[PDB]
Subunit: 254 residues, 4 copies
């Protein structure tokens, strides 16, 4: 039960967004929710998706995580508007189609560094700024994918960016640990989202989960959200630097 | 919230048992609990310990996991007295005192095989039998330790038994996934229990966690119980074959 | 990599297709003295005939059933008296009943489960205790594992747990024997057509999946395992211990 | 092994203490032709003096700052023009500011963080792409990593996240290049006193912990890394790819 908890959720773009799954779960358990977005188009969808939630107040903030000024000023606004928070759900990644849909060995330097900037660095800076709003401690969760642990066809530059993110989670847990701030990841199975449309062969992946994973079915955004809720609450006290695979057991087999 | 849920908890010996930490957390959450024990002293103990719980009635069953018949018959009786269950928490392990200090290379065939029997195989047989009481699906959770993953000083034969258990967990996940039975492990931090006294240089471990793990403190039984609640509930619906470390982040550092 | 003046004990040759015969060809080709242990008389007979492919000037053959403390204890004792001190051991032994290597892992029997732990993991612990006695200046022990010890692989069932056990055995043996300068390591071989492979349900489609999916897009062979064994048993791998090296065309690295 | 008639590229020798020089001593001792790349004018000076310890009939030296695409592309193209096709590349290159390295990891600047990814990870990707044109019939690429890419190690900070990146880079490069028969691997070295070690806070206390705790109860050296590189770079390790071999006295295996 999360009444009188406030969580910031970053990276809802639409109703299929994994972080909207997180939102519905957290809202149902009584949280106050603050949302951040990048595109105009995404603020519009958030305003519409808010009608399905129980939030009596719309707390929306533009934060493009490529800009230090925007993350710093964003979290500062959030602190002035709603006070201290209890956690952040990070659901942000990006890479070019142009590098994604090409050999990994042909990835461009700007492509590679772009994906690292948005998909991994962004957590470090978010954590630094959110830490300011968690003087009593709290919890930070980022969304990763199995392709950060193993080479997966076509995930390419994004696999390297998730490996980097997963380590970022471990170094931040060590660092922020003494401040009672836990940092973890959920390694989500494949889910039809907007971003999923730029992974070559996504449908083939989806079906192979169905055929092969222990549970013989894919997961959805709400199941990510239910585990998010575990990690962001005191239930997962004593759990930090961890990666939870929410993926039908797929990670455990070969 | 676990009202209208029934769980079998194996391996309470005394107030300090990790499984009592589980009992307290589930009991708080409104579950019906069934207990299994090995020796009669754990029974009296247990009868006195359920005075703390809000369990309206004592459901206790002697099961030695070394006996197929005791596992088979015991779960059969559980079904008869209580009907279908929702999950099993496994908190059971044994090695001989001498095999837990000095030199692993000197471990006896009998001691090695004994620790495998009780600490790993017992989970295979329990799963098979408990599955009968879970036609709609359910959740099995076993307790492991970081030594199944890295060679830890002194843990010796138990670390090879844990490594066995952790793969047991993965093979049961794959097998019982199509029946909607999830199987996971909690890798608990060091905790002062009755079995913990059998381990050479326990105290030193305890202190090194406080010094070196991200949270700079030890975990307790209730922290394991809280994550047990997650694994045993629908909150963890898409998670199977997983191992969650409830250990202050210690697994994540070196 | 020259191993003249070196002596190795190779445990678990049953025929020409055995992984250990790959090792033997490689170590022999490199000048090592080789000493062979076997279980069934038929394996010995197969050793006697396969030795005439090697440039070993004599046959050192010892019957060791790793289920028996006496036979391991006495076989190594005897090996030491015949050839002297050794440089290392290559362990290539495992066993499970067929009745437990298909269908449902949740149906494994206790005796089937403990049998596979005994032969396939414990044997390494007692072999290393006895072999230490012949390596007063240090040495190298290498065991043979498979991916299925790390991940649940269809049909490998009771063996995957035995291998998970083995891989942890290697780690604990590494820790405990390091101060004595004995390295302990594991080679994780990809699927190879052997006599024990015949017991693993689905083996053909596992061979074929490696071919289609593994980075090198081909299967590996016993000599490849041998070349990595040569590295692991020799001073080329000083500093390396408690390690698991995958000789599997890269399959472990992909999902 | 034996590496006569083979040609390797070694990137990242600054002085006699560099890991890459250990690699070079071993490969040179084994008969390989060696070609050397460097960034600072000082590193070329050191290389010219270190070449005297080696049996290289010719100095083949090339300035390549891996921050510049044109330098990597041009350098490797000149290498192909001077020495022909090559058999592999040893990559021993990393960098992070002291200023990000010695603050809380959560205080890492964006600039610092991306610099470290560029130099320490991305560089492998473009090296491999350029190196591949000189490997029409296959070859081997080895990069250098540290346990701190697998676990959070105190003070290693921004370099751990860049090693985690480098290690994924290896697997992805492994899968992509497998079918060209180029293998890609990492050596996870234990702590060795070198010029770069001086930027990692707490370094001596880390050395000491290895001594007191690593199974072999001792630290390793540059030459041990190079013996494992010779293995990875030779046909000894055919079948082996996307692998991370720890040359660290067994410390990765313990808690
Ligand atoms: N779908 C899957 O199968 C899968 C599996 C495992 C992990 N994940 C991870 O889950 C997370 C969420 O992705 P998703 O699948 O839910 O796709 P999504 O709905 O497309 O969400 C991705 C989000 O990233 C935000 N974003 C990208 N660049 C940003 C920037 N520079 N500044 C601020 N926000 C930025 C986008 O915002 P704008 O649209 O406003 O630009 C968008 O809301 C990602 O980290 C993804 O890698 C996805
Ligand atoms: N304490 C820790 O730091 C720690 C950390 C990580 C993991 N663990 C794991 O947590 C689990 C519980 O141990 P604990 O620390 O809570 O100590 P504990 O209270 O002493 O519990 C061990 C339990 O195992 C039971 N048991 C042993 N052999 C049995 C058999 N043949 N049949 C039925 N039950 C048997 C014992 O029952 P009887 O006394 O009735 O024989 C006892 O109740 C174990 O699996 C252990 O490996 C402990
Ligand atoms: N082929 C593969 O794809 C594969 C892959 C990875 C790992 N491995 C591993 O490689 C090793 C060798 O197996 P393999 O594939 O080479 O097939 P193999 O030729 O059948 O070798 C198996 C050996 O184990 C021996 N053995 C069984 N129980 C024994 C006992 N109690 N005492 C002494 N020896 C015993 C057998 O001896 P007897 O015939 O005399 O009984 C036989 O020589 C095993 O550890 C296996 O698990 C195999
Ligand atoms: N020493 C250890 O304890 C340790 C442990 C594990 C892994 N490693 C790794 O081993 C590798 C070698 O480092 P080391 O310890 O040998 O220290 P080192 O002697 O200082 O070597 C580092 C090398 O990196 C090169 N380099 C840095 N930036 C470059 C760039 N932008 N373009 C081209 N070259 C560049 C340096 O060249 P210039 O001097 O010309 O600038 C130098 O030759 C690194 O990848 C390091 O992460 C070291
Ligand atoms: C099979 C891939 C599963 C997956 C789907 C969508 C994912 O989201 C992305 C992908 C690329 C760029 C930005 C976000 C993802 O990370 C992982
Ligand atoms: C320091 C090891 C932490 C730990 C404490 C108690 C543990 O429980 C045991 C130990 C030995 C035999 C049977 C059960 C354990 O597995 C692990
Ligand atoms: C795909 C399976 C690869 C493999 C083949 C043979 C193997 O050897 C066995 C198998 C079962 C029992 C005893 C020894 C193996 O371990 C692994
Ligand atoms: C304990 C640290 C071991 C180690 C020492 C030196 C290392 O090389 C570096 C470190 C930081 C920046 C640039 C190169 C290293 O990667 C790892
Ligand atoms: N392959 C993608 C879409 C088209 C493509 O890139 O091949 C998919 O099926 O998900
Ligand atoms: N094709 C496999 C599956 C049959 C089985 O073993 O049950 C085999 O013949 O080994
Ligand atoms: N002691 C450090 C330098 C100073 C620090 O620890 O911050 C070293 O070994 O490089």
């Amino acid at each position: 039960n999360l009444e009188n908890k406030t969580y910031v959720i970053m990276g809802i773009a639409n109703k299929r967004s994994i972080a909207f799954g997180v939102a519905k779960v957290l809202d149902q358990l009584g949280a106050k929710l603050v949302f951040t977005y990048r595109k105009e188009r995404s603020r519009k969808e958030l305003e519409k998706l808010l009608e399905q939630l129980n939030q009596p107040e719309a707390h929306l903030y533009q934060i493009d995580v490529q800009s230090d000024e925007e993350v710093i000023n964003g979290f500062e606004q959030i602190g002035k508007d709603v006070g201290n928070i209890d956690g952040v759900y990070h659901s942000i990644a990006f890479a070019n189609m142009e590098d994604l849909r090409g050999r990994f060995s042909e990835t461009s330097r700007e492509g590679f560094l772009l994906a690292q900037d948005i998909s991994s660095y962004s957590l470090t800076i978010v954590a630094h700024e959110a830490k300011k709003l968690m003087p009593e401690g709290g919890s930070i969760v980022a969304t990763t994918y199995l392709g950060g642990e193993f080479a997966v066809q076509n995930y390419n530059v994004m696999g390297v960016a998730k490996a980097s993110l997963e380590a970022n989670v471990k170094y931040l847990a060590l660092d922020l640990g003494p401040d009672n701030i836990r940092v973890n990841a959920i390694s989500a199975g494949p889910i039809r989202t907007l971003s999923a449309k730029g992974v070559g062969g996504f449908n083939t992946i989806l079906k192979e989960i169905e055929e092969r994973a222990p549970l013989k079915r894919n997961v959805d955004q709400v199941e990510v959200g239910k585990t998010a809720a575990y990690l962001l609450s005191d239930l997962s006290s004593g759990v930090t630097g961890e990666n939870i695979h929410v993926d039908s057991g797929f990670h455990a087999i070969k």
